[PDB]
PDB file of C-alpha atoms in Angstrom:
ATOM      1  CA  UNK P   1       3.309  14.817 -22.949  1.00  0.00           C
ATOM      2  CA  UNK P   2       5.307  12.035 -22.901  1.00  0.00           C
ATOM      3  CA  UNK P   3       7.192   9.408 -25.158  1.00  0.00           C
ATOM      4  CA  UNK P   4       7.031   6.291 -24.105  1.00  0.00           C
ATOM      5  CA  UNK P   5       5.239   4.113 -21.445  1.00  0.00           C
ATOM      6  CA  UNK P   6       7.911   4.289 -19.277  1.00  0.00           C
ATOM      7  CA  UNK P   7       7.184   4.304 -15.542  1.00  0.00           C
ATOM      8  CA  UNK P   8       9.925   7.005 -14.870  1.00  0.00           C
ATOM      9  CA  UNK P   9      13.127   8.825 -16.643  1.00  0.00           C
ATOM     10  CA  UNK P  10      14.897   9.172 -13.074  1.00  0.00           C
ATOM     11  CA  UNK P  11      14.393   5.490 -12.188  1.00  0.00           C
ATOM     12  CA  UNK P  12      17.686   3.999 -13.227  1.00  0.00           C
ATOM     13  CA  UNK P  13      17.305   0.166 -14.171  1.00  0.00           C
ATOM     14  CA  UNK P  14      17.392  -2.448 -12.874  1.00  0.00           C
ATOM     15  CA  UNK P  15      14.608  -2.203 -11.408  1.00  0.00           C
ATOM     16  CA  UNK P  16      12.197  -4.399  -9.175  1.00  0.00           C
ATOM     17  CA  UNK P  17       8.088  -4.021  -9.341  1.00  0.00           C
ATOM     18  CA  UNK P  18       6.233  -5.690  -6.592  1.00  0.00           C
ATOM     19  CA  UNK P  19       2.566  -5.688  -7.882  1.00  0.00           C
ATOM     20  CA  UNK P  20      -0.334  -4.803  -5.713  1.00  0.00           C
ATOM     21  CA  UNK P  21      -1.737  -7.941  -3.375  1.00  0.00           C
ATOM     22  CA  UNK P  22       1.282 -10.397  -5.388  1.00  0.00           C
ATOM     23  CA  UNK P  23       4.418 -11.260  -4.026  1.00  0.00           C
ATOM     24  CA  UNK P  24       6.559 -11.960  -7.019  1.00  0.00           C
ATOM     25  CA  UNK P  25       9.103  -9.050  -7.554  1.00  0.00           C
ATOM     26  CA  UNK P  26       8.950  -8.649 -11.109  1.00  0.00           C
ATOM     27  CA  UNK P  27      13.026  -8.057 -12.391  1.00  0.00           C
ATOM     28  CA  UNK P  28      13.414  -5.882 -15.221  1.00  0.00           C
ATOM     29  CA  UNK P  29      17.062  -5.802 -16.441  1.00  0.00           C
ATOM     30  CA  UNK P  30      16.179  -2.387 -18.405  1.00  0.00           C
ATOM     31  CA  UNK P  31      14.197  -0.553 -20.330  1.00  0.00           C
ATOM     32  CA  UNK P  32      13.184  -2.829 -22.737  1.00  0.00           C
ATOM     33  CA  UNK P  33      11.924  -5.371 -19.982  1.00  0.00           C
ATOM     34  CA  UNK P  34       9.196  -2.964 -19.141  1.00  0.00           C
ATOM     35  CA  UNK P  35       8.603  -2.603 -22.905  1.00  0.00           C
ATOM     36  CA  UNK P  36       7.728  -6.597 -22.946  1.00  0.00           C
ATOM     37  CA  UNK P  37       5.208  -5.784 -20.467  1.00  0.00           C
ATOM     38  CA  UNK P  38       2.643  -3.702 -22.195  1.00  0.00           C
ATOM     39  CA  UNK P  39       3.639  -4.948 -25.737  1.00  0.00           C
ATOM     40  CA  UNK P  40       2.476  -8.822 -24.564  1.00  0.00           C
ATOM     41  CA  UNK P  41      -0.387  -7.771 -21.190  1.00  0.00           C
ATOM     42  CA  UNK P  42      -1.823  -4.374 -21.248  1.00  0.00           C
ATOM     43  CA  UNK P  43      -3.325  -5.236 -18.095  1.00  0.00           C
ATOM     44  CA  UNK P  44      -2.584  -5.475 -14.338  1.00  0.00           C
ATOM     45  CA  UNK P  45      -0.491  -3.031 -12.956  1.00  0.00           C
ATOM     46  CA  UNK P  46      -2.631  -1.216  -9.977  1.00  0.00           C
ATOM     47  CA  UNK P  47      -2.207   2.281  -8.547  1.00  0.00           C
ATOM     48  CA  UNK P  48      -0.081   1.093  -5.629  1.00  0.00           C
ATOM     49  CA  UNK P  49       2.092  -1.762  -7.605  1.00  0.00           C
ATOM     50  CA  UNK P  50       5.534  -0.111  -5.861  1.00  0.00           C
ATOM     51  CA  UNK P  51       8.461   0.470  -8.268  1.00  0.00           C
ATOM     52  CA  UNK P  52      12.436   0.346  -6.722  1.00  0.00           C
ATOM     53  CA  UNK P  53      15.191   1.450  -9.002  1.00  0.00           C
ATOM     54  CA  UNK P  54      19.147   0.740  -8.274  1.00  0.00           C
ATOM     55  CA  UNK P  55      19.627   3.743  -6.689  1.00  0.00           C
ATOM     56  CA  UNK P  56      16.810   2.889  -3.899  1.00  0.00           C
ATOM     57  CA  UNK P  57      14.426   5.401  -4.990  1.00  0.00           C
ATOM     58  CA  UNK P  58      10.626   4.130  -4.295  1.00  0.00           C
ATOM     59  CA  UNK P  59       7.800   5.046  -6.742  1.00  0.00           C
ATOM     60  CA  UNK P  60       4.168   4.133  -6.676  1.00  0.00           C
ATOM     61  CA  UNK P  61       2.077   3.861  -9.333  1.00  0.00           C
ATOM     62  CA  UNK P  62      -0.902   6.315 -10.025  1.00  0.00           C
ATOM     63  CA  UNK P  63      -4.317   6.530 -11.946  1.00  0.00           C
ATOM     64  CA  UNK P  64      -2.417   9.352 -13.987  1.00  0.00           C
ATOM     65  CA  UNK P  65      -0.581   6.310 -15.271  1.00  0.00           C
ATOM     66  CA  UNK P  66       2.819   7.909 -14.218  1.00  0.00           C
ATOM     67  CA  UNK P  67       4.850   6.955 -11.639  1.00  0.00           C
ATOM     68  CA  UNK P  68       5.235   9.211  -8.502  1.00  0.00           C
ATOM     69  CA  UNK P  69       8.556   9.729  -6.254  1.00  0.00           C
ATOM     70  CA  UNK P  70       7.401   7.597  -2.989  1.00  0.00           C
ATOM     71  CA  UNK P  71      11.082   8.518  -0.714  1.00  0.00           C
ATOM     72  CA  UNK P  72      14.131   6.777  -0.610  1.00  0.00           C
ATOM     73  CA  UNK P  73      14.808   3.800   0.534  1.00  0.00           C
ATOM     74  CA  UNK P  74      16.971   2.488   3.396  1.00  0.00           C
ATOM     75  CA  UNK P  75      19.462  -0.859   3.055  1.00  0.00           C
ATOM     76  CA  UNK P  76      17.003  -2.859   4.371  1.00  0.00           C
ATOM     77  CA  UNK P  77      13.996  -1.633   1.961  1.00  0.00           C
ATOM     78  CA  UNK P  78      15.232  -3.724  -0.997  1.00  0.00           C
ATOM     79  CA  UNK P  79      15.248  -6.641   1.493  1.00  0.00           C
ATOM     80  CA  UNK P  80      11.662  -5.890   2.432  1.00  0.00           C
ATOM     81  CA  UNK P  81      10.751  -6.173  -1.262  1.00  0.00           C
ATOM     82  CA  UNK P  82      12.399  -9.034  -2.081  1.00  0.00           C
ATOM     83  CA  UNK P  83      11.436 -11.014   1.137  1.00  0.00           C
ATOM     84  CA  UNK P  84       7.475 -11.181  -0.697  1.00  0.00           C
ATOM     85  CA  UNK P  85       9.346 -13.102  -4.300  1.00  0.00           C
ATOM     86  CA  UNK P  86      11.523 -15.639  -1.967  1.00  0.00           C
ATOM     87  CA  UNK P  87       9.616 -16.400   1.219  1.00  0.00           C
ATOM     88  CA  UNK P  88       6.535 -16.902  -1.914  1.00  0.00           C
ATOM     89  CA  UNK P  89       8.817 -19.591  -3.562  1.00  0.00           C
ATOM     90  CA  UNK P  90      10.290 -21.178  -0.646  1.00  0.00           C
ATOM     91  CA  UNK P  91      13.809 -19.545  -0.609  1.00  0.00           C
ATOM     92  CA  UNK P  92      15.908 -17.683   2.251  1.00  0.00           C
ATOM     93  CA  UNK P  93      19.378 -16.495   1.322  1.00  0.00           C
ATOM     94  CA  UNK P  94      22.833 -17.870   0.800  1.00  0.00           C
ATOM     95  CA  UNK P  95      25.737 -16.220   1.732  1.00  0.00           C
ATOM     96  CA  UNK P  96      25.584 -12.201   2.950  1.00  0.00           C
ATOM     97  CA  UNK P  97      22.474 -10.321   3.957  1.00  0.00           C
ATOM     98  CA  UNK P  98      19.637 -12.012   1.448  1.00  0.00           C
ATOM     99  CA  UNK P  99      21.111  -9.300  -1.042  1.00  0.00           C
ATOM    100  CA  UNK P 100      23.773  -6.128  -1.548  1.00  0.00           C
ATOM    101  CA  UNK P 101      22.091  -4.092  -3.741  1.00  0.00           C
ATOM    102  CA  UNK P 102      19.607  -4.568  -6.886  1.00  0.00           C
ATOM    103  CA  UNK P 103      22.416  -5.572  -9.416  1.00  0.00           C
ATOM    104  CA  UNK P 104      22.651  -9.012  -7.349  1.00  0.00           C
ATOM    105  CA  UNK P 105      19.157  -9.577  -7.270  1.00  0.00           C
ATOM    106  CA  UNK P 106      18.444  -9.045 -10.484  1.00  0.00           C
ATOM    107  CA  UNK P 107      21.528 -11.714 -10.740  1.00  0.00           C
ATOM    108  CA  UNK P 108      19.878 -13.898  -8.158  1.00  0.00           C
ATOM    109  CA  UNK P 109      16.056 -14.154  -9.305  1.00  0.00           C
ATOM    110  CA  UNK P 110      17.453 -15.059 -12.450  1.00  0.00           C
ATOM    111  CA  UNK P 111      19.243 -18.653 -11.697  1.00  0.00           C
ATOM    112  CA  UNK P 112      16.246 -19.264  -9.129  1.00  0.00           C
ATOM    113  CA  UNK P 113      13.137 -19.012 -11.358  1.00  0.00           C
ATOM    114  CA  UNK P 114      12.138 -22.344 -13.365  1.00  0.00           C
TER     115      UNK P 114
END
């Protein structure tokens, strides 16, 4: 029983999905950018695509279609993600560590993509 296709209620958006064998770390400013997914492609998403939330919790996907709790994640986990979406591009940082936090990639992905 559940009420929406949600991937989790504890994941607190932003949040960043890194789909199995891609690269691109898929932004989702909220709740309603995970809505656009399966409302325009019902497809994809593989039991394994990764999920990060803003407070660094990692989730994986399963065939259950829920997500599960996959740890914590340390400073350097978010960079690990988002090294796939820039190093797939062609980019590598400007200014600070690649990134702070989620918030400023979500901020960042955003004035890169064309």
């Amino acid at each position: 029983m559940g009420a929406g296709q949600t991937p989790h209620p504890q994941l607190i958006w932003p949040a960043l999905l890194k789909q199995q064998g891609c690269n691109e770390l898929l932004p989702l400013r909220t709740n309603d950018d995970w809505q656009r997914f399966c409302a325009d492609s019902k497809h994809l998403l593989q039991y394994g695509d990764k999920l990060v939330d803003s407070n660094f919790h990692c989730f994986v996907l399963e065939e259950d279609a829920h997500w599960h709790p996959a740890a914590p994640l340390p400073p350097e986990g978010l960079n690990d993600l988002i090294r796939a979406h820039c190093a797939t591009l062609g980019h590598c940082c400007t200014s600070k560590m690649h990134l702070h936090s989620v918030m400023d990639a979500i901020d960042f992905l955003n004035a890169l993509e064309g």
